[PDB]
Amino acid sequence: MEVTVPATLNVLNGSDARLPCTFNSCYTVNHKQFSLNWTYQECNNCSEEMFLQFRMKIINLKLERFQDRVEFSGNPSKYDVSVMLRNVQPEDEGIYNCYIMNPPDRHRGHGKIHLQVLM
Amino acid sequence: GCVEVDSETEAVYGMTFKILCISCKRRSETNAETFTEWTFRQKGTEEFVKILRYENEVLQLEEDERFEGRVVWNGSRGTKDLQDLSIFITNVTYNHSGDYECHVYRLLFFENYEHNTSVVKKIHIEVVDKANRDMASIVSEIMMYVLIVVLTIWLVAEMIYCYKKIAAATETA
Amino acid sequence: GPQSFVHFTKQSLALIEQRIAERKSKEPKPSSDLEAGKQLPFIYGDIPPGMVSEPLEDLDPYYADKKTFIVLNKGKTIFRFNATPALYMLSPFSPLRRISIKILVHSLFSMLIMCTILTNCIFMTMNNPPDWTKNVEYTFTGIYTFESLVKILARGFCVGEFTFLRDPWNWLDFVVIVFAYLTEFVNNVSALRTFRVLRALKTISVIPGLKTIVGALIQSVKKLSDVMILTVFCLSVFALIGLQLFMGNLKHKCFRNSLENNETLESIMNTLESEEDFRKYFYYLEGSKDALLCGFSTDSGQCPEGYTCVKIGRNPDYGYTSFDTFSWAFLALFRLMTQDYWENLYQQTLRAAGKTYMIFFVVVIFLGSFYLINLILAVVAMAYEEQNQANIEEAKQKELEFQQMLDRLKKEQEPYWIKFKKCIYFIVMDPFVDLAITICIVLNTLFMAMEHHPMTEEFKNVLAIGNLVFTGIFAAEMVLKLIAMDPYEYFQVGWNIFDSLIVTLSLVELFLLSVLRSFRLLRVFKLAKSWPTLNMLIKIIGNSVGALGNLTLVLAIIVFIFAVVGMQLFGKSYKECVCKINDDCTLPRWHMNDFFHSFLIVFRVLCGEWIETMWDCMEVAGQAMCLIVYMMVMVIGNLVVLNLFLALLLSSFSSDNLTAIEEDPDANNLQIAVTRIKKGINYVKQTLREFILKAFGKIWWNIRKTCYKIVEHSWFESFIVLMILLSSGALAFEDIYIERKKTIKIILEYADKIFTYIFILEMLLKWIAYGYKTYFTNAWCWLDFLIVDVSLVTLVANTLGYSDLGPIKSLRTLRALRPLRALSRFEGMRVVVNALIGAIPSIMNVLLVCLIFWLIFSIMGVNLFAGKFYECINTTDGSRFPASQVPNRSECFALMNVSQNVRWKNLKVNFDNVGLGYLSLLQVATFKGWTIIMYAAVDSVNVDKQPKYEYSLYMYIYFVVFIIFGSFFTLNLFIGVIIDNFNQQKKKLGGQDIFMTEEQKKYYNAMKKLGSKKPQKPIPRPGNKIQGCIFDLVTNQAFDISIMVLICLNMVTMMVEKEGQSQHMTEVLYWINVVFIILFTGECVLKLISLRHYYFTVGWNIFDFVVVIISIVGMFLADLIETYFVSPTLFRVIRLARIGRILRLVKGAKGIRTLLFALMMSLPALFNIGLLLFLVMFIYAIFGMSNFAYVKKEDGINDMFNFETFGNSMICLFQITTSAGWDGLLAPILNSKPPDCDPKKVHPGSSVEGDCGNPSVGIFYFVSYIIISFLVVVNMYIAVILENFSVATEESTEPLSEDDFEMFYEVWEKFDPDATQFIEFSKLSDFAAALDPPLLIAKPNKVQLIAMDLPMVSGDRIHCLDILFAFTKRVLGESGEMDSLRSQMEERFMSANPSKVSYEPITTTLKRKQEDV
Ligand SMILES: CC(C)CCC[C@@H](C)[C@H]1CC[C@H]2[C@@H]3CC=C4C[C@@H](OC(=O)CCC(=O)O)CC[C@]4(C)[C@H]3CC[C@]12C
Ligand SMILES: *[C@@H]1O[C@H](CO)[C@@H](O[C@@H]2O[C@H](CO)[C@@H](O)[C@H](O)[C@H]2NC(C)=O)[C@H](O)[C@H]1NC(C)=O
Ligand SMILES: *[C@@H]1O[C@H](CO)[C@@H](O)[C@H](O)[C@H]1NC(C)=O
Ligand SMILES: *[C@@H]1O[C@H](CO)[C@@H](O)[C@H](O)[C@H]1NC(C)=O
Ligand code: NA
Questions:
Q1: Are C585 and A27 an interchain contact pair (Cβ–Cβ within 8 Å)?
Q2: Contacts of A105 in chain C (CB under 8 A)
Q3: Taking CB atoms and an 8 Å cut-off, how many pairs form between chains B and C?
Q4: Within this chain, do residues C86 and C167 fall inside the same structural domain, yes or no?
Q5: Nearest residue to B94 via CA among B3, B7, B8, B17
Q6: Which of C503, C530, C557 is where one domain is finished?
Q7: Domain that residue C556 falls in
C-alpha cells in the first residue's frame, strides 16, 4: 500500500504541526472495517506508544506525554489519515507512524515521519 | 417435472379409485418439508371431518368406519418434500361419495428465513354402479365417423360426375 | 536513357538557380516511375561504380528546374532530397552531409533499425522489468536519436520540400524522440510506457511494403461511411425501443415478505453492502452473484413463495446490463449486433418482462445482427475488388509498357554403385511404391486414431510397436530415394524435404515429447498431390505467408501492440483491485497482469467475446479507458481480420486457379496405377468369363383420367395444404400439460385417425392417376409415401394392442416428421431445397477435407489430454479440492470413504477419444462451451493426478492454433467453394435468382423499377397570391433542412429520458414533445395547402401523413390509457409511435435510403429461405418436446428455458440458430448414468419415469441443427450480398423521342422523294450524315454502316425500317424491349403493306463487303 508522508517534518516550537498522511488504496473506505493506528517512538529501536486509533470511530488515547494537544485532522473516506499536534513542544521530537488497513485490501500501509522541533 | 392434474370425479362401486391431489412448489430448486391432512364431507352431511394425516413417511389414518382398511398412500415417497398427495381407495363404497378437502402444509427453507405456507384443493366424488363414459369420447368418435363418411361421399360424387364428363368427351371425339 | 547520370556539382546547382530566376522574371506531374522509393528503370541499366551513393543530379524533368538532388543506392532505390542547405548550413557537396546521406540509404542502416525495434518489442513484453534494463532503455533511446539526427542532417529539417518533417511517419519518430527525453527530464508511469508502444509502429516504416498495406486498410474505412451511419441510426432506433419497452425491468428482484423488527424495503436498502447480506432479504440462486430476476406477468419468471417481486437496487453484471438510460441501451444493442453473450441478456429480459418480448430479440437479430453485418462485409469486399482491379489494370498496363520498351530496345539493336543405384531407381515405382506409401499413411493415421483413455497395456504395446513399424517403412522410403536419386537431386523437391524433416523428428522421438508424437500426423498432407481440395487448403495457408504475408504480419503487430498497451494500462489495476472481481482475492482466468494473459483477451475479442472481460476491466480500471481500448480492438482488428479473410478468398478463388497446366500434367502416378487397374480387373474378369464359356379396356383408362383431374385440381391441392397444416398444428399441443386438457387430448387422437385416412386416400388417388413409376421415380412422392407408411404402422399396431412395445413407442416420436409434407406444396420452400441440394456435392468434399484436418487436431488432443480432466470435487459447493490434499485418485477415494460429498469426476465433453475430441473441437470452433475445455487442458497434470491451477498454462497455444487453422482457414475454404457453386447454379438457368420463385421475380422486376424512376413533373403552383407564397416556402430546400434539424432535436429529446427521472423532467419532456407534434402537423398542413392534391402523389409524403396521425393518436390515447383505463404494458407499447417521427430522416439520407432499397429487394428470397428455417425449427421443436422434456434442469436448461412446451422449445431453438448456448442445452442431455440422473425419478402428473438424457440422440440433435442452421444462414448471406453487389454497381435510364423519328422521316423524304420506302446503298452514307444527334453518324460512316449488317433487297436497295431499327438499336443497345418493339414494328408494317413479294432480302452489308473482298 502506497502511503505518502514527509520523511522529515520540521516545525517551530509552539506552532501547530500537521502530520500529513494519505494512502492510495483503490478499495472504498468502509468505516466498519477500516483500521488506523498512530504510534510514537523516540528512536528506531525504541518503544512505540499508540496515541490515536480508528476502529469504528476516532479513539484518542489521550497519552499523558501529549496532554490534549493531539487531534485527528484527516478524512478516511478521502484517503487522508493526517493528525494535528497543537502547540508543539520540544519533547514532541521523535518518530510518528501511520499504520493503515483497508479491508479487503490485503496489504497494510505504514508511513513514518521524523518530527524535528526548531527553536 | 411437476404438473397439477385435477382428479377424476367418478368412482365405481366395488372397485379401486385414486383421488388425485397434486400441489407443486412455485420453484423446483427450492427445498421444503410438507405434510398433509384430509377432510371428508359425505353427501347430505354438512361437516368436513378429518380422515387422514400423512407426515414424515407415515400415514396416520383416523378412526372412521367408512375408510378403515380401505385407504393407502398413493402419493410422493421417500422424501419429506411432497408434491403429490394422492390417496387410493382399495374398495369403493357408497359412503365415499361426497366432497374432499386436501390440505397441503409446506415449510420452505430459505437463506435466513423459513416460510410456512398452506394450499387447499377441493375434490368432489360421485359413487356409481357403472362407469358412465365421457361426452368427449362419445361425440368425438361420432364426429370422426360422420366427417369421414361425408368426405368419402364427396369424393365419390366428384368422381362420378367427372367420369361421366370424360366419357361424354370421348364419345364426342 | 542510361547515359544520363551526373554528379550534382555547384555548377548544376547554379544552372538550376539561374533557371528559377528566369522563371520568376517571366512570371506537370513527374515520372511515377522515377518517383522516390522506386527502382531505377532497367532502361538506365547499371550505374557507374562512382555514381552510386552520391549526390547526383535530378533525372525527372518536372523537378529538373526546381532545386533538388537525387541519390541511388546499390539496389537502384531512388531517393530525392533538397538542394537547399540543411538548416541553412549543410550542402550536398559538404562532406558532413555527404556522410549522413551515405548512411541514410544503405541496408546496414535499416537492418540495424529493424533489430532495434524488435528487441524493444521483446523488452516491452516484461511487466516488472528488472534493473539491468534501464541501461538497455538508454541504449535503445540512443539508436533512435542517431537515425533522427541523420535524417535531419541529410534531408534537412522542415523548411524545404523533401525534408524530414514533410514525411508523415517521421512525425511518429519525432514524438518517440520527444516523449522519451521530455518525460524523463520532467521526472503516470503507465502513460509513459504506453507512449513507448509507439516505437512498435516504426516497424511499419521499416519493413518494406507495410505502408502500402496500411494505406489500403485506410481505403477500406473511407468507403464504409454510409453503412457506419446506418449502423449508428439503427442501433439508436432499437436502443430507443428497448429503453421504452424495458426501462427498469432488469432492476426487479424477489423481496422477502415477512420482516422482523419493524423494517422496511427502504431502511433495509440503505443498510446493506455485502452479498452475504443481500442474500438474507433477496432471493439468490446458489452460486449466483446477482439476485434472481422475477417479473409481474404470467409469462415472466416467478419468485418463490415467501418473496414478492419488486423494482429496487442495482442492475445485473456489476450494473452494466440495462436499458435504463440511452447510453446503456446503445451498449446492449451493439452487443446484440455482435451477438456477444446475447443469450444471457435475452434470458434476463424474458425472465423480467415476459416470454412475449422475444419478438423484440428476433427483429434485432434479423435487422442489426445479420443485415448490418452483411452490409459491412459486402462494402469491404467491394472495396477490395475495386482495389484488385485497379492493381491489375495498372499492372497489366505497366507490364505491357515494359515489354514494349524491351521491344524498342531490340529494334534499336537491330560401377557397382552405378548398377545397383539404377536398380533402386527402377525399384521405386510410380504405380506401386508411391501408391503403397499412400496406403501406409492412411493406415498409420487410423492406428493413431485408436489411442483412448481406458486403454490396456496390451492395446498400448500394439500401438507403440505399430508406431515404430510404420516409422521404419517411411524411413526406408527416405533412404532408398536418397541413394537412388542423388542427394542434391533429392533435396531439390519440397515434398521430399518435408518428408525428410518428419522422419528426422520421428527418429529424435525414438531416441528420446508428448506433442512431438503428433508431427507424424502432417504426412497426411502428402495426399494433396492427388486429392485436389486438400491442395486448396494448402494454397490458402501458403498465400497467408507468401503473397499476403505482409498483411498477415501487420495483423500480428496490431495484436501484439494491443496486448502490450492493454497490459501497461490495466495490468497493475488487475492486481490491486482484484477482490472486486474475485472473492478469493486471486486473479481471474482472463486478466492483463502479464503479457500472455493479455494477448489472450485480445484474441478472444477477435473471436467475438469482449463483454465479459470488459465488465471486469471496468471494475478494476474505470469505464472510460476500458471502453476506449476494447472498442479500438474491436474496430481496427476485425477490419484487419476481415481484409485478410477477403484477400485470401479472392486470390485463391480466381486469381490462383487458371488451369495453366493440365489435370495432373505428369499423369498422377495414382492415375497411372488406376489405368493399370482398369487393364487388370477388366481383362482378368473377361478371361474368367471366357473360361466359363469354354466350360459350358377404355374404362380403366377412364378411371385414370379422372384421378388425374381431381389430384391436379386447385381445390384438391387446397384441401391437402389445409390438412398438412392442421395435422402439423395438432402436434404442438402434445406437451407436458396434455393431462390437464382432457377434451383436447381425446379430440386429437380422433383427429389423427382422420388425418391418416385422408392421406391414404390421397396416395391411392395419386397411384391410380400417375402409376407406380411416375410416382416411385419422384422424390416428393417417396417422402409422402413414407410418412403415410409410418402413420399406418402406428395405427395398425395401436388397434392391435401393440402401443407400448418400446420400439413401436419410439416410432411414434417420428410423427415430428409430418410437417415435411409441407415442403412440396410451397414453391418458396421448393426452390430453396433445389438450391441447397445442388450445393451438397461440393459441400461433401469440403467436409471430407475438413473432417480429416480436424482429425489431426483430435488425435493430438487425445495425446495431450486423454485421462487428465478427472478431478476431485466437493459437490455441495461444486469446487475442486486442492492437490496439496487429495492429489490423487487414491486419495480422492479415501476422502470419499470419510466424507460423503466427494466425487472423482470427468468433464462430459473431453478428448478421451477421437469421437469426443471432435465434439470438443466443435465447441472450440464455434466458441460455445470452450472456456471450460481450455481450463481443464491448462490445469492438466497427468492421468489420475489432480489438476492444478494453470499447471500447463501454455496449452492455450493448442487452442489458438486450432482456431486459426480449424476455424479460420477452414471457413475460408468453405466460402470459396460455395461461391463458385452458387455462381454455377445461376449460370445454367440464365442468371435468374436461385432463391426466388416465378411470380416473385415479376414483383422483383417491378420494384427494381421503383428505385429507378426518372425525374417527375414540377407540381403546378397555386395561382392564388397567398397560396403561391406558401408553395414557394414549403418547396424551398431550406424548409426541408429545418424540418430535418427538428427531427434530430426530437431524437435528442427522446434520448434524454431515463429511469428515476424526476416528475419535473417527465413534465418538461412531455411538453417539448407536444410542440414537436404541433410543428410537424403544421408542416403537414402548409404542404397540404400549397401542393394541393399533388401531396399524395409522393410516397414519402404519405409516410409523413401517416406519421402525423400515429403521433396525434398515440399521444391522446396514451393519455387516455394512463387514466380511464390502466395498462402499463399497453401504455409503453403504444407510445412507440413516436419512432415514426425519427424514421423520416431517411428521406434525408441518400446513402442509407439506397442501402435500405437493397434490403427491400432481398425480402422475397429472405421470406423464402426464412419459411424453410421456421418449418425446420418446428420439427426440431416437436422432437425436443418428445425426447428432452423431463431431463434434469441444470446449466442452460431451467424453469423458463427448456423443452416442456412448444413455446418453450421455440425459444431455445431461436437462441441456438445463432449457435448461442447450445453446449449449455446439450450438457444435461449427457447425463445418462447415476449419480448424474435418477432412472426411477417420479414426475407428479405423468406416468413417465427418470430424468436422464440419451447422449447419442442429444449429440445428434444439436450437431444436426447447428449444421443446418449454419447452412441456411450461408444462404441468407448469399442472397443479401447478391442484392448489395448489384444495388451498388447498377444504373438505368432511357433517352429518345417522337421528334427523332420525325427527323428521320424529314431527312428520308430528301433521299426518297417518290416515297418508295427504299434507298440505294450508295446514298446510305450521305443519309446517315444528314440526320441530327442522337441518330447522326459522322463521316467516315462507312465502317460503322458495314458493321450494322443491314439486309439488302433486289437492286442494292435497303428498306426504311431496317435502317431505322439498326440506328434505334445503336442508341438503345441490346435490351429485351428492342425485340418486342421490333415485333410490333413488323406486325404494324405487315398490316399496312400486304405485298410480301417486294421485301425478300438477298444479301446483307457485311456479307456484301466480304464478297467484294
Ligand atoms: C408387392 C405388392 C403388394 C406391391 C408392389 C408395389 C410395386 C409394384 C411398386 C413399388 C415400387 C415400384 C417400382 C419403383 C421403381 C421402379 C423402377 C422404374 O424404372 C426406372 O426408374 C428407370 C430409371 C432409369 O432408367 O434412369 C420403373 C418403375 C418401378 C419398377 C416401380 C414399379 C412399381 C413398383 C415396383
Ligand atoms: C497419491 O498421493 C499420495 C500423497 O498422500 C501418495 O502417498 C503416500 O501417502 C501415504 C500416507 O500419507 C504415505 O504412507 C506414503 O509414504 C506416501 N507416499 C510416499 C512416496 O511418500 C500416493 O503415493 C500417490 N499415488 C500414487 C499412485 O503415487
Ligand atoms: C355405509 O354407511 C352405513 C351407515 O349409513 C353403514 O351401515 C355401512 O356399513 C357403510 N358401508 C361401508 C362400505 O362402509
Ligand atoms: C415499529 O418500529 C418501532 C421502532 O422504533 C418499534 O418500537 C415498534 O414496536 C414497531 N411497531 C410494530 C407494530 O412492530
Ligand atoms: Na464475452
A1: no
A2: 579
A3: 109
A4: yes
A5: B17
A6: C530
A7: 549-655
